[PDB]
Design a protein around this ligand. Structure first.
Ligand code: NA
Ligand code: NA
Length: 129
C-alpha cells in the first residue's frame, strides 16, 4: 500500500506516534517519506547484508527476522515480512522500540540527514488530524 501523506499522518497519530518520546507527528511523516516514499512494501538491502523493511525501513540485523541476515537479533519478535502489511501496526510498534534505544530518531539515518533541523511540521500541514 502506498499511503497518502495525510492518510499516513492519521494512521500514525491513531497509533500514538504524535509526540511519542517527544517527536511531533511531522517527524514521523517526514521520515516515512524519505525512507519509503510512504510505501508499505518498500524493501532495501543495506551494505552490511541486512535489509530495511516497510514504511519506516526497519532493519533485519536487529529488529525483525528475515531468515537471511547474519547476526540477526529480532528484538521486535516479528518476521520482517509482517512489516510490509497494508496495516502499519507492526511497524509502529517496532519503531516505538527503535526510538527508545537511546539515539531517538537518529536511528533513522534518513531522518537525521533530511528531517532533523528542518520545518517538519510542513509534513502534516493541511492534514485533518
Ligand atoms: Na523504496
Ligand atoms: Na506505549
Amino acid at each position: 500500500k502506498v499511503f497518502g501523506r495525510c492518510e499516513l499522518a492519521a494512521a500514525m497519530k491513531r497509533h500514538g506516534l504524535d509526540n511519542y518520546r517527544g517527536y511531533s507527528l511531522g517527524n514521523w511523516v517526514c521520515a516515512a517519506k524519505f525512507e519509503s516514499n510512504f510505501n508499505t512494501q518498500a524493501t532495501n538491502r543495506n551494505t552490511d547484508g541486512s535489509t530495511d523493511y516497510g514504511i519506516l525501513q526497519i532493519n533485519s540485523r536487529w529488529w525483525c527476522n528475515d531468515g537471511r541476515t547474519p547476526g540477526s537479533r529480532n528484538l521486535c519478535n516479528i518476521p520482517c515480512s509482517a512489516l510490509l502489511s497494508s496495516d502499519i501496526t507492526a511497524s509502529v510498534n517496532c519503531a516505538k522500540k527503535i526510538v527508545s534505544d537511546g539515539n531517538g530518531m537518529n536511528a533513522w539515518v534518513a531522518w537525521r540527514n533530511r528531517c532533523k533541523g528542518t520545518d517538519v511540521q510542513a509534513w502534516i500541514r493541511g492534514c485533518r488530524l
